[PDB]
Amino acid sequence: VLSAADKTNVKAAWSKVGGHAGEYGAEALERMFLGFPTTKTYFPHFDLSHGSAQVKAHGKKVGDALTLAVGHLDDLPGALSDLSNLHAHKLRVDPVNFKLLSHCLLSTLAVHLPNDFTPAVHASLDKFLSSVSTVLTSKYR
Amino acid sequence: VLSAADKTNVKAAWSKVGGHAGEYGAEALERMFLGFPTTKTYFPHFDLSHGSAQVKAHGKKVGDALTLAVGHLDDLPGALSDLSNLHAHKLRVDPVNFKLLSHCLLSTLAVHLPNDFTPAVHASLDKFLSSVSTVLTSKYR
Amino acid sequence: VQLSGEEKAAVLALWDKVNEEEVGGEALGRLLVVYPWTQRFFDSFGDLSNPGAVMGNPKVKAHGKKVLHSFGEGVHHLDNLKGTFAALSELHCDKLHVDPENFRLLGNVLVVVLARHFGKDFTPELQASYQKVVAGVANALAHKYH
Amino acid sequence: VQLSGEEKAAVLALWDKVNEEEVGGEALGRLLVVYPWTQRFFDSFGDLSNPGAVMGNPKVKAHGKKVLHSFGEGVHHLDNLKGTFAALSELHCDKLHVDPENFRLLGNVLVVVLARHFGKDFTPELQASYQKVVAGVANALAHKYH
Ligand code: HEM
Ligand code: HEM
Ligand code: HEM
Ligand code: HEM
């Protein structure tokens, strides 16, 4: 998919994320809900303002799916196919929201890994997240 | 790349375009220059206002490249690779401009093939043009 | 929007020929078929599972007609778009939370449908003026987001 | 932009800690590396062929500082962004013809750079206020296009 150099950078960067993938996934969602209020409509108000358990669970799943993707960069459509059916076919998530989440994920990585989030790594992660987004929005039917 | 159904629709629709591909390519460029003035910066003023030969030549090349793409839907990156080097690496064409041209191309098809430009065909052509655009913006280095 | 006196007259002359029901139904139908995530907002219309179902759906036609009528109000109030669309901006942004990118998408679909219906009379120059009109409407509808 | 009194104070307090040269150079550098088509506008800066060349380039740092200084003017004039950026809108739209999408891209890069420098102090809530600020600036710069 990506270039060999990007693949190398992404695998490397994700090794530094390690066990924090789910925590970063949850924080990225929070950043997204507050920064981009239109994204809140897919979720119960209670889960966004009076709780955190369901957001954290979606956060862990986001983190796990990205970890899976990093291990299958040569075949993203095959590793993430099922998630497109859910997000596009069933829930009809507007594609713009994957761009918003991607920005919030990069923001979250910059906060926690300031020394590892170099310009070259930033560029490769951006391309990775755009490829994941492309797969997630591939099947609206 | 696209789904089997889209591939079928695109090959069919392009057979109705036939020998008019270059003429449609030139008209789509004109529509784009007038509708979206920022796109004019990549070209000599003279070619946009006091002539038409160079626009028509770019138009024919656009049409020929789309015809080539339709015959290689399974491997677009391989058929259009060289054009990405030119448009992205050498000329640094802003990616937004491929979206603008795509819209103007759909507009041009609707003008000339009103009875063949059905909703299903519109949807498949949109996906095709988006895939071509993705390839053309694949190598900024 | 930034329209010359000549462009404005051309824009209004074409609108006299626009059948809001026919064009409206077709524009909304195409939005639903070409950009299927938009279907999330129109569950009440019924079966939207395939192109034939969408284009023939009487609720799609009736709502498309209302959408086009509202575009017509904009075309006749080019100097006060924000004010003309204030209440609609409230509805779309505060109640429905429609992402503004979809306003642009609908505007572009409308232009493609005008092209389909008017053919060669929908010249590159007239399309240019219409692109300024639809951008203007999209921006006015997105006003309550900013 | 739509900012509460509490948000505004939080936004201004963070800006007191912003080194416009350091943050500015880094924001422009990242734009050039992550979105390389933007390099088309900065030929005079010299070698931009790889990340190390870009981030260390003294012209990138000097121009980034000017860009950030101008963001600072916006942060201190949140109630009159259009007026604050009128002349810059003329330059970017009428002279350079920069596509407005790139204004948003730069705004988002700036937010990522603030996050990198401030770490946990750049909370989800403070990022939210900054997103409204950068959207506001992007829109004001795009004003002469509409
Ligand atoms: C990298 C991007 C994303 C990934 C990998 C991802 C992953 C997932 C996963 C793994 C699930 C749970 C599937 C299951 O076990 O039932 C899920 C559910 C869901 N996702 Fe996402 N998601 C992403 C982005 C988004 C976005 C941007 C939104 C909307 C703004 C969204 C909205 C939802 C919703 C509404 C559910 C259903 C929750 C439930 O039923 O409890 N997702 N996602
Ligand atoms: C489907 C999309 C497009 C295709 C297939 C396409 C195709 C081509 C081809 C085949 C060439 C000539 C290569 C050669 O023989 O030297 C060319 C040149 C060029 N294209 Fe495109 N093009 C597309 C879109 C665009 C866009 C959107 C722009 C800018 C708005 C653009 C700007 C240029 C420029 C500036 C040249 C150089 C012209 C010259 O040196 O005479 N192209 N394109
Ligand atoms: C940008 C051009 C648009 C215009 C001019 C427009 C105009 C209108 C008008 C006139 C109404 C009727 C208001 C009422 O119920 O009193 C309406 C309602 C509505 N609009 Fe739009 N609209 C636009 C785009 C969109 C898009 C992009 C979406 C979402 C994909 C959308 C979703 C809706 C929905 C769900 C309703 C309520 C109708 C119902 O409850 O069935 N609109 N709009
Ligand atoms: C959206 C935030 C932006 C702000 C606040 C900003 C601000 C500025 C400022 C303060 C100047 C100096 C004006 C002068 O020369 O007197 C300038 C010039 C310039 N800007 Fe921007 N800018 C922004 C985005 C962009 C982007 C996205 C591009 C293109 C990718 C761009 C390209 C340029 C260029 C080429 C110059 C002239 C400098 C030279 O000749 O080397 N700007 N801008």
Side-chain angles (χ1 to χ4, degrees), chain B residues 37-38 41-42 88 91-97 100 140-141, chain D residues 32-33 36-37 39-40 43 48-50 97 99 101-102 145:
Chain B
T38 55
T41 60
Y42 299 96
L91 297 168
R92 267 106 46 118
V93 177
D94 194 316
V96 168
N97 299 325
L100 301 181
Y140 281 97
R141 277 137 148 200
Chain D
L32 293 174
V33 168
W37 57 90
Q39 293 177 20
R40 175 176 186 255
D43 283 347
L48 305 174
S49 56
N50 65 78
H97 296 109
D99 191 277
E101 178 63 17
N102 300 295
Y145 269 130

Side-chain angles (χ1 to χ4, degrees), chain A residues 42-43 58 61-62 65 83 86-87 91 93 97-98 101 136:
Chain A
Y42 299 96
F43 307 95
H58 189 208
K61 299 297 175 176
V62 168
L83 300 182
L86 171 67
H87 289 87
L91 297 168
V93 177
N97 299 325
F98 296 96
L101 178 59
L136 288 176

Side-chain angles (χ1 to χ4, degrees), chain A residues 30-109:
Chain A
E30 309 175 5
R31 294 180 180 271
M32 185 189 68
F33 297 140
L34 299 179
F36 305 99
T38 55
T39 62
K40 306 194 305 191
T41 60
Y42 299 96
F43 307 95
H45 169 78
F46 183 95
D47 287 351
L48 306 195
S49 307
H50 295 295
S52 71
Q54 303 306 317
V55 173
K56 284 192 175 26
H58 189 208
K60 203 77 190 195
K61 299 297 175 176
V62 168
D64 287 346
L66 292 177
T67 296
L68 181 70
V70 166
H72 297 90
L73 290 170
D74 288 304
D75 187 24
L76 285 182
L80 303 176
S81 154
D82 185 30
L83 300 182
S84 182
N85 187 261
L86 171 67
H87 289 87
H89 180 246
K90 297 188 168 204
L91 297 168
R92 267 106 46 118
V93 177
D94 194 316
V96 168
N97 299 325
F98 296 96
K99 286 166 53 207
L100 301 181
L101 178 59
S102 294
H103 166 68
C104 289
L105 260 163
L106 296 177
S107 293
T108 296
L109 297 173

